[model samples]
Target chain A: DAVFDIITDEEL
Target chain B: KTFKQRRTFEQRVEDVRLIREQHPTKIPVIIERYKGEKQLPVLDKTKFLVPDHVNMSELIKIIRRRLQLNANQAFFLLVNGHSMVSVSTPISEVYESEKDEDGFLYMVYASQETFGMKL
Candidate 1:
């Protein structure tokens, strides 16, 4: 299933 | 990542001779300092930050309360830690108050989750 996740990924 | 800045500012302004602003806003009292504009709008008690730091869940709650949606999301870039970068999602959508004149206000809902990122 294609997850509609609110990606809270912090790019550093 | 083009990070080196102290050198860039020098290079850009080296040849270019630009007129400096004679009058500048007061550093101590930023909000109080105003130019030749309409009378200061009265500070409303309603306008205030709901929380200090907000997450996705809190953002959704505030947005729902204000009758806003993801489609109305206004992405804004802000300097996080000196040179670092961050994003702020304006949940409260801008609405026109006056018909003829462009008078608008964004119902200050809640602060968005700050994700620290490298530019």
Candidate 2:
């Protein structure tokens, strides 16, 4: 399964 | 978090460029670190340029050896990367020379890769 990972600039 | 890393930063990393002189004495690509940030650990300016004077035929030969690939494959890979912003060349004004017949110098940006890992 593929997990979608979206990170904000700050979170990054 | 900081103790182990600060000590390793003391050692210096030398900056070196590899240039090839064409047979006709035409200066082939000049590969060297970016002018603004010559030292290590500097931000954003860590890059190199392969200036345009390189011969395409010779470039393919060298690329084949360096990449361990055939001539055609090397040419394809080179052109593909050159077309994209992934690789670039110095502007004519910077080198004060015309572009080459087959190959041109390419610029490469070297930056630190930070990976975020969860423990």
Candidate 3:
């Protein structure tokens, strides 16, 4: 797994 | 136009504003694969919140790990589609200069192209 996931979903 | 087309400038700015408030120590980033690249795989996600203190070298290593790259594989992360920052440079510095008009730092990755590969 990536250390940083896409936690901020700007939805684009 | 892909990214800019999806959201208005003010909306993007607001998104970054909220993101920074929540993760004040992190830098918002968008990583995508170079469209010209045929040998590399696109990242599953585009948005990231990376620690501002991390160095470019450290960031590259993280992406390498995510991509499961081999030692021999040639890879690079291009900033704002053109510049490559020094590995020792802090991610914050790059973001300060290279962040897009919409507020996110955009990067594209690709492996080195070989001379005979296109044939």
Candidate 4:
């Protein structure tokens, strides 16, 4: 889930 | 509640018409803070003319960067105020199914809320 998930630059 | 409440349905429809005519490859998007949201700030500009090829994750990054969020901060984009789509989903795909009656893809952003626990 985008809301609860941590943001990471690897996903970019 | 931002774009729709400010602009009439006809105006939005016509705006989309002109936008698509001028930028056929771009997808019109409006991102706003949820009405009851208190953790995030409203965007300086709500309407975004995004590349149709862009995906949900990219768009989310755009918003995240605009807000200068920390790496640990969490926020998610919502379609039609309720549904969340796949990160890799194309903007074109979301637009196709989620665009408002006015023709723009409407989305809301909200941060995770904690209970009485202090940060």
Candidate 5:
């Protein structure tokens, strides 16, 4: 399990 | 408890990304700060536009300042599970062969054991 999931910012 | 409430304090953890917007040389980067000894928020946005001129150590300093972490606890950044090259290594590179042709970069603040060096 990833400590923190990485998500690309669509808004940026 | 009899009181007319106005507003409640809430946690503020939004990234403004003002640096990227202002910087002239922008290179795409994906940052991941691991679950260290301290409680840290999972970054909502991973993709970032960082300065291309910045090197590994310099970038580390910038990240350190951004995270407000002191120097006592060492933070190690890795790429492909290898500690990032530190000798004035290009934030992107002077890549001997791996030149990062993908136009991408990664940074991680994972766990480390002082002088023992345990990836």
Candidate 6:
């Protein structure tokens, strides 16, 4: 994952 | 439109409907240059339209070529700190699943020395 902003969520 | 919810980490990242997914099909890509860095065409903005499914690396090459053709000084690109794209990135599906996708907008930084790095 080249993603680096959000940490966690309910419906990822 | 859809800011995702990651149940595990307990936070939110990436938007679906607004950013990557313009419609059931189609994606809008916008690049922001570092105007303060050097001299180049002062575009308020430039919009590149692309469909779903593309290599992230290919896009970088195009961007790299564009910058080279125009700017004497050059820089690199990244997303959510992810650089070089390397995506079958499609600029869409790649983003759709990214933790940093938001507003269908990508933050492009044109970095370099104040004037020139090499002589």
| Top candidate (DockQ) | 3
Residue pair clashes in candidate 1: none
lDDT of 4 at B113: 69
Q: Residue A10 of model 6: what lDDT?
A: 23
Off by over 4 Å in 1: A1-12, B1-46, B55-67, B70-74, B77-84, B87-119
Error of 6 at B61 (Å): 2.9
- Compute the lDDT of residue B66 as modeled in candidate 4: 74
DockQ of each two-chain model: 0.02, 0.01, 0.16, 0.06, 0.05, 0.03
Q: Per-candidate TM-score, first chain only?
A: 0.19, 0.29, 0.12, 0.43, 0.33, 0.29
Please write out the lDDT profile of model 3 over residues B1-119, one tens digit for every residue: 34455668897788788888889878988787777787877666667888878888888888787688889988888888675647898888999998888788988888877212321
Backbone atom clashes (below 3 Å) for every candidate: 0, 2, 0, 0, 0, 14
Winning candidate number (TM-score): 4
The 10 consecutive residues of candidate 4 chain B with the worst lDDT sum are: B110-119
Instruction: Pick the winner on TM-score between candidates 1 and 5.
Output: 5
Pairing residues by index, what is the TM-score of model 4?
0.82
Better of 2 and 6 by TM-score: 6
Q: For residues B1-119, what per-residue lDDT tens digits would candidate 5 score against the true structure?
A: 10002112221011123433444456556566653424333444554565566667766666565556666756666654467656478754632333233333545565455223753
lDDT of 1 by residue, B1-119 (tens): 11122225454232111211211210000011012222222222222222224432444444343333364543221211122112243212111111112111122222233322434
Residue B9's lDDT within candidate 5 is 20
Indicate the residue-level lDDT of B55 in model 6.
58
TM-score of every candidate relative to the true structure: 0.18, 0.23, 0.79, 0.82, 0.54, 0.47
lDDT of each: 0.23, 0.27, 0.74, 0.74, 0.47, 0.45
What CAPRI grade goes to candidate 1?
incorrect
lDDT of model 4 at position B67? 76
Q: Which portions of model 4 show Cα errors greater than 4 Å? A: A1-12, B114-119
Q: What is the lDDT of candidate 1?
A: 0.23
lDDT accuracy of residue B77 in candidate 4: 71
Return the interface RMSD of the candidates, in order shown, one decimal each: 14.6, 16.9, 9.7, 10.7, 7.9, 13.0
Q: B73 in model 5: Cα distance from truth in Å?
A: 2.2
Top-down lDDT ranking: 3, 4, 5, 6, 2, 1
